Structure formats: C-alpha cells, structure tokens
Design a protein around this ligand. Structure first.
Ligand SMILES: O=c1[nH]cnc2c1ncn2[C@@H]1O[C@H](COP(=O)(O)O)[C@@H](O)[C@H]1O
Ligand SMILES: O=c1[nH]cnc2c1ncn2[C@@H]1O[C@H](COP(=O)(O)O)[C@@H](O)[C@H]1O
Ligand SMILES: O=c1[nH]cnc2c1ncn2[C@@H]1O[C@H](COP(=O)(O)O)[C@@H](O)[C@H]1O
Ligand SMILES: O=c1[nH]cnc2c1ncn2[C@@H]1O[C@H](COP(=O)(O)O)[C@@H](O)[C@H]1O
Ligand SMILES: [K+]
Ligand SMILES: [K+]
Ligand SMILES: [K+]
Ligand SMILES: [K+]
Lengths: 334, 333, 334, 333
C-alpha cells in the first residue's frame, strides 16, 4: 500500500472568492509583520541571492516598506559593509543571511556588530537537526535578536523551528523558479499547502510565516497571504529590476538580466524590469485590488478570513488571457 | 487549515447530456427574458466595451432578437445620442452602461430620456458597498427603470444585488478573454460554477441571471444557460464583426479588428467574422442543435432540466477535433 | 446548484489491468456479434461515410471478418448496386446506412431487395422520438431484418432504442475525430462512460453494443470492448487505406487521403495507410496482445471480466513514448 | 458498470515529504538488496537491452555498487562469454536475461557455468502461466540459482512469481521511455501505484521488488524506492553513455547514441551523457539529497517510512524550472 499523506495544492490550483466589501483598493492597509517583533509597511521581502539582493536593491526595497536580505556569497566585511551601508540610508531596516553550518560564527557576530535588524539562517532543509541546533545556539547568544529559520513546508517542521527560537518561519521547499530540488530529489510540497500547514502551527505561537518561492504573478501574492503567509519572499520579481545586481543583457531583440540558483538550481536569464519602485507599485496594486474584491481591509483580514475555491487546469486557462492575440502586453502581465 | 469553499467548474470542465427529444432544432423556442419585464427573442446580449457595442451593432443585435449596451467612455451627450439612434432605428430596445464615480447620475439622467430601456452599471466588483449603495439610490431615484447589477460570482453576491433593487444579476469575475483580474488579484470563480450559485438564489426571486464572459463557441452558450443563466453576454464573439466598431485590420494574410478591455486587462487581435447576422445564426444554430439533443423545448427547460456530466482533460480533447488535420475549416470552428 | 449527473471518462482516462493468463495472443478468439443474430470474426466495422466506406473497402473488410456500411451520400440504385456488388464477392456480409427522416422508405426497400444483411438507421440523436418511430415502422415491415439504431450515449437512450426493436445499439455522441458536435452544441458524453452506461441496459436484452467514434490507437479497441462494446465502428483507421474512397494526396513531403465529417463536422486530411489488410493485422495484433495480458481467451472474456484503473494525464504521458527522440516510427504507432 | 479497481499514480503525480533529519546526504547508507541473498552498494541495476547492457557497462555499473544484466539477443555462447568477462573483471557480480521459448534451458545452462549470479527472465507478461511454469521448472532444475521474475504490475501478480519460486519481483507494464505496450494493447498500471501493490505483498515474504522503467531523473529513483522497491532498473538513463553499446552519433550539433526497445516499442535517439561513473554520482547525489530531506538513514527507511503527497498538474510545473529561461544547464537537468 502506497503511503500517501494527503493531496497538496499550489497557486494555480486555487482562486480567491470575491465577497462583500467596504474597502477601496486605495484604502487597503498593507502593513504586516516580518517577525514577531518586526513590522513591514508592505508584505514583500527580497530573496538573499547574489543575483537578487545586495546593498543597492535592499535600499530601494526598504524605501518602499519591505526588507532586503544580503546574500552570503561574499566576504564577511563586504557583507557587513553593505548592511551598515543600508543602515545609514535614512534608518532603513535590513536582514542578512548566513549558512547553517559551523563557521558562520563570526559572520553573524560582525553582522550583529554591523547592526543587522534580522538574521536569516539559510538551509535547504529547515527541519534538519543540524539547522535546528544552529538556531538554538544563535538564539542564546543573542536572546532578543530577530532570527528567521528555514526552509520547511510542514507543520512539525514549522513547530520544530519555533521551539528552536525563531522569530519567523520561512516556508518553501522546491517552488523556486530557478529551483530543481523537487525534480532531482523527488521531495517537496506545493506551496499553497506548504504555507497553510505551517500557518496552522505558527498561529499558535503568534509567529509570522514567510512564503518563499513560486510567486509569478501579483495574484500569487494574495493567495500566499490568504494561505496564511504574513509576507512573501521573491526572486524572479526582483530579478530584472535596475537596482538588483548584474548588468542588462540585450539578447535576440530584448533586454535581460542574470538570475541564477544559489546541483539543485540553475543559471538563467530574466526580463529586465526597469526600476524596482514601479514593480512594487504594479505588484502591490494587484493585492490592493484583491483586498478590495474580498472585503479585506487589512492583511490580517486577507490572511485569516479570505476564502478559496479549487479550480481545474481548464479554470486556470480561463483565468489567463485566452482566445485572442495580445497586441499590447501590460507591464504587470509580463 | 486552508479555507476552501468548494471545487469550481467552468465550460471546458463539463458537457451536457442528451435526453429523450420531441424538439427539432428549427422548432425550438429560443425566447427568454433579459430582466423581470423585458423579453428577448434570443438569449444573447453584447458587452458594453468600446470595441464591441455602439449604435450599429446594437441595432443589428436588436434587429435579430437581442439587445446592446452602449459603452460609457463617451461624452454624456454622445451616449444619449447612440441610445436614441437605436430607438428610432425601428423602435428597438436598447441598454447602456454607466459607472459609479463621484458624479454619474447626470449621465444616468441623460440616458433615460434618450429612450433607453435598461440601465447597466457594469462594475469590476458588484458586491462592493459603494456599488450596492449606488444601486439603491438609482432605484430610489428611478423606481420603474429596469436596473442591471453586477458583476458577482457567488450566491451571496447575487442576493445583495437583488435586495439592493436590481432587475437582473450579471455574473463574471475574471473569465473574459481579455481579462487579467484573476491573474493580477488572484480573485475569481470559474464561470459555470459562478453561474449556478447566483442562479440558485436569483431563481427564488424569479430574477434572471446573465452570463458575462468566457463564451468561445455556441456550446458555451448552451452550458451557461443550463447552469442557470437566462441569457449570456459576449465580447470577443461579437468583436471583429462589421457592425462592431473599428476598421478591418490586415495582418500577415489574416484579417482582424481591434478589441480592448475597459491594470485589469490587455489589448489584442480578434479575427474578422463577417456581418453580425451571420454570426448569430451559427451560434443560435449550435444552440438549436443542443436543445434538440436535450429535448428542451424552451430556454427555461434547458436552464432548469438539463443535466451535466463532469469531464476530464482527455474528455475535452476528444470533444474537439483530433487526429485529423483540418483541410476545410467549418464556420463554427 | 449545478445539476451535475456524474463524472465521465474517455479512453485516455483509463488503462486495462493485467492479470493471470492461460492464453497466447495468437490463440485469442476475436469472434463476436455485430447484432443479436449477426456474428463477426473480428470486432471491427467501418463507418458509413463517403470518405470511408464504399463497395471496395466493404469487401476488403468483410474478407478480414468485419462488416462495411455503405454510406447514403449516393443514389439508391448506386447504393443498391454496391451492396449486391459486395454480396457477390464470395457471400460477403454487408450493411447499409439510411437517414432517419421520412423519404428513406424505398431506399430501405431497395437495399432489402438488394439483399443487405443489416440496416443502419443513422442520426445525430438516437434518443429522439422521430428516430425512435422510424425504427418502429421499419421493424414491423421487416420483422426479422437486423437493424442498428443510434447514436446514443445513455442507458435510457439505449433502452429506448431497444424497445423500438433494434438488433444492436450504436454508442457515440461526439467522440468522432472529424466531429465538433461536443464543441458546437455543448452536448456529449466521453466514450468510455458512454459505452458502459449503454452496456448496462443492452446486457439485459442480450443486445450487442457498437462503440462508435474516438478510437485512435489499437489499445482503444481493447478499452471500448472492456467498457462493454461488442465491436467498434471506426473512420480515422480506415481513412487512409488504399481500399477506402478517394485518391492519395502527396502534400509537403508525404502521402494523404481525404477524410471528412458527414456544421457539426469538418473536411480534413489523413495519412495514407496502404492496404487495409495490414491495418487490421496491426490493429487486431494489439487486441490479441491485450487479451493475452489480461487472460482474456475470448472477446466476451474481455468484454465482461476485464478490469480498469483510472489514470492521470501524467499517467497517460507515461503510457506514451516519452523522453526520447523517435527515429523509426512503428506502423502501429502512426 | 465500468469495472474500475482504483485510481493509479506514477512519478509525476506524487512528491516526497521532508521529515526531521539526522542524516547528512553524504553519510546516507545507500546499501540495499537485489534479491533474497544478494546485496548492492547502490539501488541501481541496468536493463537487459542490446543498447544498454553488455560487458563494459555491466563491469562499470558493478564497479560502482550495482549489477548489469547482459541482454539475450546473442549466440548462446556469446552471452556466456559476456558474463564471464564481467566475472574475471574483478570478481564482479553479474546478471543476464533469458526468454521462455520452445527451448531456452540450453542458454540457461550455459549462463550458470559462465559464473553468472542472478538469472533474469524478462517477459512482457510475468503473470502468464507459461512464464509462471517456466519459472517453476528452472527453480526445480536450479534450486539455489537466484531467479528474477517479472514483469508484473499488481499485488496478485507478484504473489504468483514468489510462489512460483522467484528470488525477486520485477515491476513494469508499459511505462518505459521506448514502450508502446499501453498504447498498443491498452493494458498497464502507472509505475508508482504498480510498485506499491507488488511491494505490499512481497514485503510479507521479505522479497525485494525491482522498479523497471519510468525513471527520468534521480527524483524518480527516490519515489520508486519510497513506494516499496528495493532497487530500480533503468534503460534510457544509462543508455547513450560511453560504456553503453554503440558509437557516438552526431546529429545537428547534438551528440547521441542509439537506444532500441526489444510491435511493442520503437527506436530513437538518447542524449550522450559521458562516462557511466559520472551519471551515477549525480543520480545518487540527488538520492542522497532526498534521504537527507526525509531523514532516512538507509534505503529500507525511505522504502518503509517516507510519506508521499499527491500533486496536481500545476504542482508538477512548480516543481520543474519555470519562468526563467535556462542559460547554463545543470548536469542533472
Ligand atoms: O540553491 C538554492 N538552495 C535552496 N533554495 C534556493 C536556492 N536558490 C534559490 N532558492 C529559493 O528560491 C527562491 C526564489 O525563487 P523565485 O522567487 O520563485 O524565483 C529563493 O527565495 C529561495 O527560497
Ligand atoms: O478590461 C477588462 N478587465 C476585466 N474584465 C473585462 C475587461 N473588459 C471587459 N471585461 C469583461 O469581459 C466581458 C467580455 O468577455 P468575453 O465575452 O469573453 O470577451 C465583458 O462583458 C466584461 O464583463
Ligand atoms: O456528420 C456526422 N454526424 C454525426 N456523426 C458523425 C458525422 N460524421 C462522422 N460522425 C461520427 O464519427 C465517427 C468517425 O469518427 P472517428 O472514427 O473517430 O474518426 C463515425 O463513425 C460517426 O459515428
Ligand atoms: O521494446 C520494448 N517494449 C516494451 N517494453 C520495453 C521494451 N524494451 C525495453 N522495455 C522495458 O522498458 C525498460 C526500460 O525503460 P526505461 O528505463 O524507462 O528506458 C526495460 O527494462 C523493459 O522493462
Ligand atoms: K481571463
Ligand atoms: K470530436
Ligand atoms: K511508455
Ligand atoms: K521549481
């Protein structure tokens, strides 16, 4: 007998159910929490990747209300340099990622000295004991430092991270656009199910959930939040924008930037997205519209009370633009 | 736990079932009702888009048993003129759309005295309080004016419209060919499920339900009605036609005409499909072949008696043309 | 509330379950019944279409053990000519189709005089009273003439046809390769479900079921039979073969023939299939192999006792050839 | 009523679940068992196809912790030689395939005295009486010769093989890359469901189950084991390699090697993928990253403890690379 735990759903398997509303899209409140002690003005944080977030993007993102995470594919000093560099740009908040393996001891130390607002312990498997123990050791050394652990996709995995002492649980095993983990390993959980399962446990402790990977459209943000996420960590959305690392590549007619997986990942190309400020404006414009459609005055309104309906592939095809030859693609329909 | 109401279906997810029939397709009674007090000879109405419905198409559709809704992005005086043109063009019935911004009753006032019959207030969210409020005022300000409210996609949504005072409930959240609302916001319900949910409530009041969007062929029209809609509204299906606004466009051997949605949508190319009279006969022809298959004498029967079956992805490929390479295309395909 | 009757399946939704076997493929018995009083050596009959079955194909098919149906898109005399022409080729059996509308009165008369072995009353809707009454009128005039009615896809539709006096019920509303009925009307039932539902009623009366339309591979034959069909009516399989009407068309590199729908249908092109004899050999070679895999000594063994399993689109993709670039396509994998 | 046993699933229908882990990928114990009395260092064996396994690939796979099965379309004397070559090539274990025609024990006799360890009788129908009979005779004629029987895809099918006297049950009816059996006959069961059904029976006898076909990546290997297979058999994954029979082929900028099935199949092109040693490290690497995710210390745990989740079509697209355009391809992708 096959040991099937359950059925699992991702973003294209569901739609948000429209409801009675006393909220205008321009009156929606996008304020939320990144950690238990850290609040964001917009529910967006950047991925800690060499092709996504350095000091330049982290500033532009923080100016819009989010938080950038400095990747760890550089020297400690350089990483510490960028944090302070971000910190001295109008009192901006900034996170910094580290490895879960021993050796990040003084890297964390310097970042704390560099005045990092939230530490991210990064791993492919947040439910591994080696990762759990690094959180415990890190928590004791800095009793009130905000720390984010991951990644997981299960309730106990979320539960295990919480007693380790995390301030927020990051959800996502496989849904990364440049990720092949689910293919190469055969292990993974469709992101919508991943969020809700972790949301079920994190809610007990009042600990925020970060949905990480898989977001491709602005409507995906609304679904991740409605699944239980406090905010979303994205890469393919910030890959392309001017502020992100890497130069623009003109290829076979159009502009591109490099977007690679930090083999589980790949090295790819992604459409240049101009200035970050417009991207967030476009992205948060869909959420606000969604919050208007579902009567969600706040993010907590959407995160806790919004309803779903399950759809087929035929339903998703109906959701997309269909049976017409597009002549002017919208900037948000890239 | 993830809050899933239920699984929702649309056109390609289902098929209708042939029953014992005493109805020949040509004899079938296609007559139905747009609103509480407005009948139609065919269950087809046109979308209030500036690339679909103005006077000519409205007149054409009305001179075939339907009704058109003149779009609203004009001068207030232009839309009244367009309405009037249809009215003097053979005493045809006509509708027109308005919004709900800080100031719209002026346009509403001008339209009624243009001889307009049914007022449409097409919104991207029919269940919003502002729309619900703007509907109550208009009904209070115009007690005998037939009012169409929408769009909604739930059972509870249609209830509000009806209790707000609408004469008809319009259904559709993100299924339109040009629509990106579901992609941009993540919000929406598959049309057929959306149709059935609103109808189930609206039938008890005796209020007609209108299917707005998602119709690609005449088969969809049949399914939309069988799910509970008293009539359907189309955009792409009527777009591109001669009577539809815009010159013909020549593009790489193929002929087209523009089609723009009213950022919640995009602009694209739709194929040129001759005079509107020719389209309707084919679309009603397929509908007639449906009623003949179902043994449905009138629209009401198909709407209330016809049964569906749920199909799979393979079942939808078996439905379309397969194996063979199309050498001589069919008018409706 | 939406009035959904049930879920319906077609050929690609299922697979036959392999079982214990004491049968070799070359020892499988393909003998079956077309009507209650007519037995076939192979469970195949041709479609009564102008691009499929005239006198030439009907002979070649009958020589292999099947029965051809002369289409009615010709004069009565010409149609009567072809039947006799087929009849005088070694005592071959032959069917002939007619319309359900009044006016086929003497066409049937001549065909009966022409010595047709089985009459087919053809209609898009076998469950229509006008069609039912033509069977009743036809049955009385020729009390023991073998008559086939259709098309239906439901149990009562099969039941209604039976009391009308049919000798066999033909199943299939929409699955035709050149058919667009399900698209244009929105009415139809996936063929696997269509057969079984009709099989449930026809079994009560010992009346054979003819599965009509949708067969694309030899494995589809086995599924139709296992669904409850006594035999299958095919068009796209006999379209292309040398014996079928129409000449060979060389187009953009390869050979073709015309295959059109008798608007509900379309006019198309289909790959030239050489001699019919080889096609049947290839087609009946898959059935025999199937009957070996499922321990089916007879067709009744497969038709009554064979099991199914439901599969996904992922399962069907696994069933096909995958993840390799075919360099030599098999004649039966056209 | 249509006789549907149950819904059956394969690799792309499911995914594995990450559990609490005290297993680093590099520490993971990949050791398993081919048969009742034959162990393997890795759970990989090669298909007995003339475009996959002869002496060189067998030696290579055996010198990496696996075993090869020399195909049978040779002279009886050639296959014995090929077996012997592997045997003297470092005392490696080796298998070989035979049929069941009117006369095969001669080949069977020649193979055993070539030093062969496990006899394979690969059939297109393991549950046929002739195969079941030919298995009983061989076990009677060779009581201590390890016998592999198959292929089957049901629970009741594996029971017969075990009761007939096989040392291992091989599973697979139509899932192979080159296989057209399911298309030609309509008969077959999706591999993962097929794996679980045979295993559920074979585990009670303590008999190993082998997964034969359907493996495209290392992730499939993990799923096949978790469903109950003690090891997997691959054809395309090892085909094309240097040690695999055939010259390299140059075709339109890309390099290949031939791959023919043994009309139940076809012939095609598979990509060139370097020395076999390089393939296995990547395929076992992904498997190691799986066990590390699942917290599985040994193959048995993954085989008996790991849980699955059922995914949809969208869930399978989220798994693969999406959105991004691949600029630098990964070895395992
Ligand atoms: O190599 C890696 N190991 C583990 N996770 C990765 C790696 N590279 C990218 N990711 C994940 O993929 C996400 C980005 O995917 P995207 O937002 O869908 O394009 C990141 O935020 C990480 O969670
Ligand atoms: O730009 C837009 N955004 C979202 N929905 C639209 C837009 N324009 C038209 N619609 C809807 O789509 C319907 C027409 O869709 P169609 O019949 O499938 O082409 C209209 O009647 C409106 O309800
Ligand atoms: O125009 C028609 N009206 C009704 N059924 C048709 C028509 N043309 C073809 N068919 C059906 O389609 C079948 C052939 O489809 P095929 O075997 O799948 O290619 C025929 O045997 C008929 O049952
Ligand atoms: O030509 C054939 N017809 C049917 N099955 C085959 C044929 N050749 C190989 N197989 C099966 O397919 C397996 C290999 O499939 P693969 O690992 O997916 O490429 C073999 O071990 C056999 O079980
Ligand atoms: K849409
Ligand atoms: K069809
Ligand atoms: K296959
Ligand atoms: K992925």
């Amino acid at each position: 007998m096959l040991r099937i735990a359950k059925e699992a759903l991702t973003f294209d398997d569901v739609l948000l159910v429209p409801a009675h509303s006393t909220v205008l899209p321009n009156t929606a409140d996008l304020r939320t929490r990144l950690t238990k002690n850290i609040a964001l003005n917009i529910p967006m944080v950047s991925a800690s990747m060499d092709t996504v977030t350095e000091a330049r993007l982290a500033i532009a993102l923080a100016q819009e209300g989010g938080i950038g995470f400095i990747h760890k594919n550089m020297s400690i000093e350089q990483q510490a340099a960028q944090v302070h560099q971000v910190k001295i740009s109008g009192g901006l908040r900034v996170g910094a990622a580290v490895g879960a393996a021993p050796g990040n001891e003084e890297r964390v130390k310097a970042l704390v000295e560099a005045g990092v607002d939230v530490l991210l312990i990064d791993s492919s498997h947040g439910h591994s004991e080696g990762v759990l123990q690094r959180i415990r050791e890190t928590r004791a050394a800095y009793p009130h430092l905000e720390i984010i652990g991951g990644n997981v996709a299960t309730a106990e995995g979320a539960r295990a991270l919480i007693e380790a002492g995390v301030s927020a649980v990051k959800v996502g095993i496989g849904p990364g656009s440049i990720c092949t983990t689910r293919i190469v390993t055969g292990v993974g959980v469709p992101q919508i199910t991943a969020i809700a399962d972790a949301a079920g446990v994190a809610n007990e402790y009042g600990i925020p959930v970060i949905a990480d990977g898989g977001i491709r459209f602005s409507g995906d943000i609304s679904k991740a939040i409605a699944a239980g996420a406090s905010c979303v960590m994205v890469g393919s959305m910030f890959a392309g924008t001017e502020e992100a690392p890497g130069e623009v590549i003109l290829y076979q007619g159009r502009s591109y930037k490099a977007y690679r997986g930090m083999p589980e990942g790949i090295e790819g190309r992604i459409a240049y997205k101009g200035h970050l400020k417009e991207i967030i404006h476009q992205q948060m414009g869909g959420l606000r519209s969604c919050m208007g459609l579902t009567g969600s005055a706040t993010v907590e309104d959407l995160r806790t009370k919004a309803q779903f309906v399950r759809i087929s592939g035929a339903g998703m095809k109906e959701s997309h633009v269909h049976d017409v030859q597009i002549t002017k693609e919208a900037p948000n329909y890239r």
